[PDB]
Amino acid sequence: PLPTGYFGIPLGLAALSLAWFHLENLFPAARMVSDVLGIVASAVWILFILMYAYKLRYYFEEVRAEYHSPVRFSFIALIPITTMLVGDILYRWNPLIAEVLIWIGTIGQLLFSTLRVSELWQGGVFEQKSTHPSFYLPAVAANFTSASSLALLGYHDLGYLFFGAGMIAWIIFEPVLLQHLRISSLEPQFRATMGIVLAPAFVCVSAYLSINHGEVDTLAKILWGYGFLQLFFLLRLFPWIVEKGLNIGLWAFSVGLASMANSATAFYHGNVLQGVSIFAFVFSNVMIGLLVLMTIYKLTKGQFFL
Amino acid sequence: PLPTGYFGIPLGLAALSLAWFHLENLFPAARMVSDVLGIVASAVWILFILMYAYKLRYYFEEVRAEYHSPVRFSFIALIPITTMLVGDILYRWNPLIAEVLIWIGTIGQLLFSTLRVSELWQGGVFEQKSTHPSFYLPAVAANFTSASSLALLGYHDLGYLFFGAGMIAWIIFEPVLLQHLRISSLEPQFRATMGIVLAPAFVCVSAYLSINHGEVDTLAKILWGYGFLQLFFLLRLFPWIVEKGLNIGLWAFSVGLASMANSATAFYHGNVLQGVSIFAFVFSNVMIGLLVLMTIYKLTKGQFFL
Amino acid sequence: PLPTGYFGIPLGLAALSLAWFHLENLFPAARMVSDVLGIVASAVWILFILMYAYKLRYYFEEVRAEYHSPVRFSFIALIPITTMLVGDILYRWNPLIAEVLIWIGTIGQLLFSTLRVSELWQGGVFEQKSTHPSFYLPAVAANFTSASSLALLGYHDLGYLFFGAGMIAWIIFEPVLLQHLRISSLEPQFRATMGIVLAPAFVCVSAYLSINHGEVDTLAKILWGYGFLQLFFLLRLFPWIVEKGLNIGLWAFSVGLASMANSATAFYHGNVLQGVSIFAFVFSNVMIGLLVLMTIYKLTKGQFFL
Ligand SMILES: CCCCCCCCO[C@@H]1O[C@H](CO)[C@@H](O)[C@H](O)[C@H]1O
Ligand SMILES: CCCCCCCCO[C@@H]1O[C@H](CO)[C@@H](O)[C@H](O)[C@H]1O
Ligand SMILES: CCCCCCCCO[C@@H]1O[C@H](CO)[C@@H](O)[C@H](O)[C@H]1O
Ligand SMILES: CCCCCCCCO[C@@H]1O[C@H](CO)[C@@H](O)[C@H](O)[C@H]1O
Ligand SMILES: CCCCCCCCO[C@@H]1O[C@H](CO)[C@@H](O)[C@H](O)[C@H]1O
Ligand SMILES: CCCCCCCCO[C@@H]1O[C@H](CO)[C@@H](O)[C@H](O)[C@H]1O
Ligand SMILES: CCCCCCCCO[C@@H]1O[C@H](CO)[C@@H](O)[C@H](O)[C@H]1O
Ligand SMILES: CCCCCCCCO[C@@H]1O[C@H](CO)[C@@H](O)[C@H](O)[C@H]1O
Ligand SMILES: CCCCCCCCO[C@@H]1O[C@H](CO)[C@@H](O)[C@H](O)[C@H]1O
Ligand SMILES: CCCCCCCCO[C@@H]1O[C@H](CO)[C@@H](O)[C@H](O)[C@H]1O
Ligand SMILES: CCCCCCCCO[C@@H]1O[C@H](CO)[C@@H](O)[C@H](O)[C@H]1O
Ligand SMILES: CCCCCCCCO[C@@H]1O[C@H](CO)[C@@H](O)[C@H](O)[C@H]1O
C-alpha cells in the first residue's frame, strides 16, 4: 500500500516545472528545464496514480481508515492537487487532455472537502491534537490549485471564487494551528509536516498572480512579506524539525518552495524586488534539488517504498 | 414572552425584499414582489416590536437573563438589525422615517455591542461552550447592516467604518468557532443555528457592494468564493442539522440566503458569473419560500408562539 | 534593573512627535510641538538605552529570564521599535544617523522574532495562560514600525513586505487572544496591557498610509472602523482595567493612541471623515498628556524607578 503522502513528490516537481516555464521568454533555456521537470513529475504521478488504484482495489480498508481519520484524510487531497498540476504541465502540449485533468482534479477536490472537511463540524472525532499543518492541503492548497488551473483555461472569475475559498480558509485555520503549535509539542513523527506551514502565503500569491495576469500589486507584496517571515521562522526551526534525522517527509516543504520559485518569476518580470526574487528562485531550486538527491539516495538503498 | 430569535423572520423577509428591489430596472415586475415582501416584513416587525415592548414591561427579568447570558445575548441584536432593514425598505416611500429607523438601529446596535460584547473580555462568564454561531449577530451582521443602511443615506465613508468593523470582527471570530465546532458536537437544541455560518461572507459582500456602488471587483469575487464553499459544506451537513426534525430555528439560514439573493443581483448587473447569480437568486428564494410555508404550517397548528 | 516595559514611554512620545510632524504644512506651529516631543522622546530613549546596557552588563541573568519567558520576552521588542521611531524623528535633522538607527532596529526586531517567536512553535513552554496582548509587540508592532521606517528611507516595496508580515501576523494572533480574554479573566497585575489591544488596527493603518503615500482608500477606512470599534470596547472596559488603581502600565495605551493621532492627520489631509479625525487627534493627545502628567507625578514621589 503506497503511502498517500508520497504524492507530495510529483506535486513539488510539477509546481517547479511550472515556475521554470514562466521564465522561458526571459531565458529560453528555461523551457528545456521546465519540460524535463514536467515529464519527470508526470511520469511519477502516473506511477503513483496506478499504485493508488491498486491500493483502492486490494487495500480498500486502508484507504477507508485514512479517509475517516481526522488527521490522515488530508493527504488524499494531494491526489486531485497533483492531477491539476500535471494538467497544467500538459497544457503546453495538449490543451484538451490538460483541461480534462484540470476539471477532474477540481471537481474531485471540491467534492472531497465538501464531504470530509464539513463532516468535522459534527464534532467528537477531530480532537485538539488533530490540529496539524496537513489540514492546509484540502482546505487551502487544493482551492488555490483549482484557482490557478481554471485561470489557465480562461475561467478567471471562477478562478477568483476558488482563490477566495482558499485564502479565507487559510486565514481562518492558521490562527488555531499556530496556537496549537505554541502549546503542544508536535510529535517528532509528524514534525516534517511543519514544512507545510511555509506553503500558504506562497501558494496564495502564486495563484493570485496566475489569475490577475501577473500584476504584482499591494496584495502580492503583502503576501510575500508574511511568506518570508514564515520562511525565516522555519529556517530557525529546521534543526528541531529534523532532530530525529532527515526523512522523505521533508517533501512537505516542496509545496511552499515551488510556489516561492513560481511567484519569484512574476516579481522578477514585474521588476519588483528583483534581488529577493533571484534569491528566492535559486534557494527554492537548491532545496528541491537536495530533496531529489536525498530521494534518489533512499531509492538507492531500498528505503523508499514501505 | 416572545422568543427573541423570532426577529430572524422579519430579518430574512426584509433582506429578501431589498434583493428584489435591486432587480426592478432589469425586470419591472420585481418591484411588486419587493413591495409585497417589504410590507409583510414590516408588518411582522411592528408586531414583534410591540410584543418585545410587552416583554420588557411585564417579563423584564426574562430580558435581563437573556441579556446577561454569554450565549443568548446575541439574539437581541436582531432587534436593531431588523429596525435598520425595515428603514431600508421604507426609504422607497418615506426617506425621513427611514432615516430615523436607520439611526436608531445603528446607535442601538453599536451601544449594544459596546456594552455587552466588550464585557465578555472580563473573563469568567463566557465559556468554551459559549462559542456559538449566534455571536455573529451582534459582532458582524449588525455592523454590516449599519454599513449598508448608512450608504443608502449617502454616508459612504461612515459606512466603510462599520463595514470594516464587521469584516475584521468576522475574520477574528470564525477561526475559534470552526475549531470549536470540529472538537465539540453542537447540541441538537442549538444545531439550527449552524445556518448562521452561511451568513458572514454573503452579508459582507452585500454590504460591500452597497457601499462601493455595486462594483463587482476582486474582493467581491473572493467573498463569494468562500461564501459558496460554506454553502456546500452546510448543504452536506443539512441532514445532520435537522437530525431531530425540522423546526422554526431554521430561519437562521435566512440571513445568508437573503444576502446570497441580494449579492446575486449585483453580480448579475455587473455581468460577472451570471449563471451562478441566477442559481443563487432562485435557490435562495425557493429556500426562504420553504421557510415561509413551514412557518404558515406551524401557525396553522398553534405551534408558533410559545 | 530597568523594567523593560518602560520603553513604552519613549515609544508613545516618539510616535506622537511624528503625528504632529505630519501636520506642519497645515499648521506651521505643529512643527515646534513635534520637535519638542521628538527631543524629549529621544532624550528618554537615550537614557533607557544606557540603563538597559547597564542591565545587560550587571544584571544579565535578569535579561536572560525575561528573554526565555513566553510572556515577558515580548517587551524586549520595544527596544528596536523605539530605536526605529527615534530614527524617524532624527531624519528631519540628520538622515544618515536616522538611517543607521532604522536599519539597526529593523535587523534587530527581525532577528529577535526569528529567534524567539518561532521557538514558541516547539511547544511545551508557552501555555494557554501566556496568550497576552503583549505578544503584539514583537509579532505585529515591530513589523509595522519597520514598514513605515523603510518607507521613510524610500524602500517602499521592502516596506510592504514588513507591512504584510505585521498585518497577517495580527489577524492570525488576535482570534486566539480575544477567545482567551473571553474565557480567562486576565489577572489585574496584567490588566493595563489590555491597552495594547487598541494598537493593531491603528498601527496598521498608520504604517499603510506611510507606505502608500497617504492615500486614504478602502483598506484604510476598513482598518479605522475596526480600530474605533476596539476603542469603544476598551473605553467601556476602562473602569475594570483600572479596578486596582491607575498605574504606569497604562502607557500600554499610548501605542494605539499615538497611531490614532498619526493616522488622523492623513484622513484629515485626504478630506475623509475630518470630524472624526479632529476628535481622534484631540482625544489621543489629551490621553497621552494625562499619561505624562501621571508620570511626572510618580517621578515626583520616587515611584517611577523600581
Ligand atoms: C480516495 C477516496 C477514498 C474514499 C473512501 C470512502 C470511505 C467509505 O466510507 C464508508 O462508506 C460506507 C459505505 O460506502 C459506510 O458504511 C462506511 O461506514 C464508511 O466507512
Ligand atoms: C480523490 C478524492 C475524491 C473524493 C472521494 C470521496 C468519496 C467519499 O465517500 C463517502 O464518504 C462520506 C463521508 O464523509 C459519505 O458520503 C459516505 O461515507 C461515502 O459514500
Ligand atoms: C489579509 C490581507 C489582506 C490585504 C489586503 C490588501 C489590500 C489591497 O490593497 C489595495 O490594493 C490595490 C492594488 O495595489 C490598491 O490600489 C489599493 O489602493 C490597495 O488598498
Ligand atoms: C525569478 C528570478 C529568475 C530571474 C533570474 C535572472 C537573473 C539574471 O541576472 C541579471 O541579468 C540581468 C539582465 O538580463 C542583469 O542586468 C542583472 O544585473 C543580472 O543580475
Ligand atoms: C433590550 C435590552 C435589554 C437590556 C437589559 C439590561 C439588563 C440590566 O442589568 C442589570 O442592571 C442593573 C441595574 O440597572 C444591575 O444592578 C443588575 O445587576 C443588572 O442585572
Ligand atoms: C436593543 C439594544 C439596545 C441596547 C440596550 C443595552 C442596555 C444595557 O444595560 C446595561 O447593562 C450593562 C451591562 O453590560 C451595564 O451598563 C448595566 O448593566 C446596564 O445599565
Ligand atoms: C480576507 C480577504 C482579503 C482579500 C483582499 C482582496 C484584495 C483586493 O484586491 C485588490 O482589489 C482591487 C479591486 O479589484 C484590485 O485592483 C487590486 O489590484 C487587488 O489587489
Ligand atoms: C440575480 C439574478 C436575477 C436575474 C435573472 C435574469 C434571468 C433572465 O434570463 C436571461 O434573460 C436574458 C435577457 O434578459 C437572456 O439573454 C438570457 O439567456 C436568460 O438567461
Ligand atoms: C536583549 C536581548 C537579550 C538576549 C538574551 C539571550 C539569552 C541567552 O540564552 C542562553 O544562551 C546560552 C548560551 O549563550 C544558553 O546556554 C542558555 O541556556 C541560554 O539561556
Ligand atoms: C534587541 C533584540 C535583538 C535580538 C537579540 C537576541 C539574541 C538571542 O540569543 C540567542 O537565544 C536563542 C534562543 O531563542 C538562541 O540562539 C540562543 O539561545 C542565543 O544565542
Ligand atoms: C482583513 C481586511 C481586508 C480588507 C481588504 C480591503 C480590500 C481593499 O479593497 C480594494 O481597495 C481598492 C482601493 O480603494 C479598491 O479600488 C478596490 O476596488 C477595493 O476592493
Ligand atoms: C488630524 C486633525 C488635525 C487637524 C485639525 C484642524 C482643525 C481646524 O479646524 C478647522 O479649520 C478649517 C480651516 O483651516 C475650518 O474650515 C474648519 O471649520 C475648522 O473645523
Side-chain angles (χ1 to χ4, degrees), chain A residues 67-68 76 79-80 108-109 111-112 115-116 119, chain B residues 236:
Chain A
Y67 175 80
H68 291 296
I76 295 168
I79 297 175
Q109 73 86 356
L111 178 61
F112 183 73
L115 288 169
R116 281 294 291 127
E119 184 171 27
Chain B
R236 186 269 196 267

Side-chain angles (χ1 to χ4, degrees), chain B residues 113-115 117-124 126 128 131 157 160-161 163-165 168-169 171-173 175-176, chain C residues 171 174-175 178-179 181-185 194 197 218 221-222 224-226 230 232-234 236-237 240 272-273:
Chain B
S113 65
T114 293
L115 288 169
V117 174
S118 69
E119 184 171 27
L120 300 174
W121 301 354
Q122 300 178 349
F126 187 101
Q128 182 59 42
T131 309
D157 288 338
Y160 273 117
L161 296 185
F163 178 76
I168 296 171
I171 296 305
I172 302 304
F173 180 67
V176 302
Chain C
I171 296 305
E174 184 154 314
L178 303 190
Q179 182 78 342
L181 296 176
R182 283 190 285 270
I183 292 175
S184 297
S185 288
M194 292 290 293
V197 179
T218 296
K221 295 170 199 175
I222 281 171
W224 247 27
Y226 190 75
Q230 299 295 69
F232 296 155
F233 286 6
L234 291 164
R236 186 269 196 267
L237 287 165
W240 168 86
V272 176
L273 300 165

Side-chain angles (χ1 to χ4, degrees), chain A residues 167-168 171 208 215 217 219, chain B residues 167 171 215 217-219 222:
Chain A
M167 185 177 175
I168 296 171
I171 296 305
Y208 180 60
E215 180 184 358
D217 61 4
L219 176 58
Chain B
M167 185 177 175
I171 296 305
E215 180 184 358
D217 61 4
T218 296
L219 176 58
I222 281 171

Side-chain angles (χ1 to χ4, degrees), chain A residues 67 110 113-128 131 135 139 143 156-158 160-169 171-173 175-176 180 208 219, chain B residues 167 170-172 174-176 178-186 191 194 197 201 218 220-230 232-234 236-237 240 267 271-273 276:
Chain A
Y67 175 80
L110 178 60
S113 65
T114 293
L115 288 169
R116 281 294 291 127
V117 174
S118 69
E119 184 171 27
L120 300 174
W121 301 354
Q122 300 178 349
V125 181
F126 187 101
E127 294 184 273
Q128 182 59 42
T131 309
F135 184 88
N143 290 307
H156 293 84
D157 288 338
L158 279 173
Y160 273 117
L161 296 185
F162 280 95
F163 178 76
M167 185 177 175
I168 296 171
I171 296 305
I172 302 304
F173 180 67
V176 302
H180 180 66
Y208 180 60
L219 176 58
Chain B
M167 185 177 175
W170 163 37
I171 296 305
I172 302 304
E174 184 154 314
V176 302
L178 303 190
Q179 182 78 342
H180 180 67
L181 296 176
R182 283 190 285 270
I183 292 175
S184 297
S185 288
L186 231 196
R191 216 171 266 178
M194 292 290 293
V197 179
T218 296
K221 295 170 199 175
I222 281 171
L223 293 166
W224 247 27
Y226 190 75
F228 280 112
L229 182 78
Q230 299 295 69
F232 296 155
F233 286 6
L234 291 164
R236 186 269 196 267
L237 287 165
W240 168 86
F267 275 76
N271 192 24
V272 176
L273 300 165
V276 176

Side-chain angles (χ1 to χ4, degrees), chain A residues 197-245:
Chain A
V197 179
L198 184 65
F202 290 116
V203 180
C204 180
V205 74
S206 292
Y208 180 60
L209 289 165
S210 292
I211 303 161
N212 87 344
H213 303 285
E215 180 184 358
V216 180
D217 61 4
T218 296
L219 176 58
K221 295 170 199 175
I222 281 171
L223 293 166
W224 247 27
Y226 190 75
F228 280 112
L229 182 78
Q230 299 295 69
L231 176 65
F232 296 155
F233 286 6
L234 291 164
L235 283 167
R236 186 269 196 267
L237 287 165
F238 189 83
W240 168 86
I241 290 172
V242 303
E243 174 187 335
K244 296 306 176 168

Side-chain angles (χ1 to χ4, degrees), chain C residues 67-302:
Chain C
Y67 175 80
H68 291 296
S69 168
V71 170
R72 293 186 286 141
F73 81 96
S74 293
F75 299 100
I76 295 168
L78 296 169
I79 297 175
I81 290 172
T82 60
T83 298
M84 292 187 275
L85 291 172
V86 168
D88 294 342
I89 290 165
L90 298 183
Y91 191 84
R92 75 190 66 178
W93 295 308
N94 193 306
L96 173 44
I97 293 176
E99 175 157 7
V100 175
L101 293 176
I102 286 168
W103 287 117
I104 291 173
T106 291
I107 296 167
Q109 73 86 356
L110 178 60
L111 178 61
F112 183 73
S113 65
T114 293
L115 288 169
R116 281 294 291 127
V117 174
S118 69
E119 184 171 27
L120 300 174
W121 301 354
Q122 300 178 349
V125 181
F126 187 101
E127 294 184 273
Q128 182 59 42
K129 69 180 187 197
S130 310
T131 309
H132 282 200
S134 48
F135 184 88
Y136 288 133
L137 301 171
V140 174
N143 290 307
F144 289 147
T145 301
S146 287
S148 60
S149 297
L150 291 175
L152 179 65
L153 297 181
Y155 297 96
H156 293 84
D157 288 338
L158 279 173
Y160 273 117
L161 296 185
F162 280 95
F163 178 76
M167 185 177 175
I168 296 171
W170 163 37
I171 296 305
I172 302 304
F173 180 67
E174 184 154 314
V176 302
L177 178 62
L178 303 190
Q179 182 78 342
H180 180 67
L181 296 176
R182 283 190 285 270
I183 292 175
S184 297
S185 288
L186 231 196
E187 287 136 59
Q189 69 260 38
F190 304 121
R191 216 171 266 178
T193 71
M194 292 290 293
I196 309 179
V197 179
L198 184 65
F202 290 116
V203 180
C204 180
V205 74
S206 292
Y208 180 60
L209 289 165
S210 292
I211 303 161
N212 87 344
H213 303 285
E215 180 184 358
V216 180
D217 61 4
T218 296
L219 176 58
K221 295 170 199 175
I222 281 171
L223 293 166
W224 247 27
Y226 190 75
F228 280 112
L229 182 78
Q230 299 295 69
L231 176 65
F232 296 155
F233 286 6
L234 291 164
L235 283 167
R236 186 269 196 267
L237 287 165
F238 189 83
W240 168 86
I241 290 172
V242 303
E243 174 187 335
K244 296 306 176 168
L246 303 168
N247 64 55
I248 193 76
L250 294 168
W251 277 97
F253 278 95
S254 73
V255 185
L257 289 166
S259 290
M260 189 172 344
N262 200 63
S263 60
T265 71
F267 275 76
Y268 193 89
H269 271 286
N271 192 24
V272 176
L273 300 165
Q274 290 197 318
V276 176
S277 297
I278 290 163
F279 157 87
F281 190 85
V282 173
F283 175 83
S284 51
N285 274 276
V286 173
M287 297 304 112
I288 297 174
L290 293 172
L291 288 173
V292 169
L293 294 179
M294 291 183 303
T295 301
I296 290 167
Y297 183 70
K298 285 295 194 179
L299 268 158
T300 269
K301 295 180 182 297

Side-chain angles (χ1 to χ4, degrees), chain A residues 23 27 264-265 268 277-278 281:
Chain A
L23 286 183
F27 303 102
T265 71
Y268 193 89
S277 297
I278 290 163
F281 190 85

Side-chain angles (χ1 to χ4, degrees), chain A residues 21-83:
Chain A
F21 190 78
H22 295 319
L23 286 183
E24 64 172 359
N25 283 342
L26 298 178
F27 303 102
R31 178 55 177 275
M32 176 67 79
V33 177
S34 179
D35 283 353
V36 170
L37 286 169
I39 288 163
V40 172
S42 296
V44 176
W45 177 80
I46 289 169
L47 175 66
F48 288 179
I49 286 290
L50 292 174
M51 295 181 73
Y52 201 89
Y54 191 96
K55 192 189 186 180
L56 280 159
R57 175 53 181 87
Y58 300 111
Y59 297 85
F60 185 77
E61 295 302 315
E62 293 169 2
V63 175
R64 174 174 180 210
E66 73 181 327
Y67 175 80
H68 291 296
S69 168
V71 170
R72 293 186 286 141
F73 81 96
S74 293
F75 299 100
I76 295 168
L78 296 169
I79 297 175
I81 290 172
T82 60
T83 298

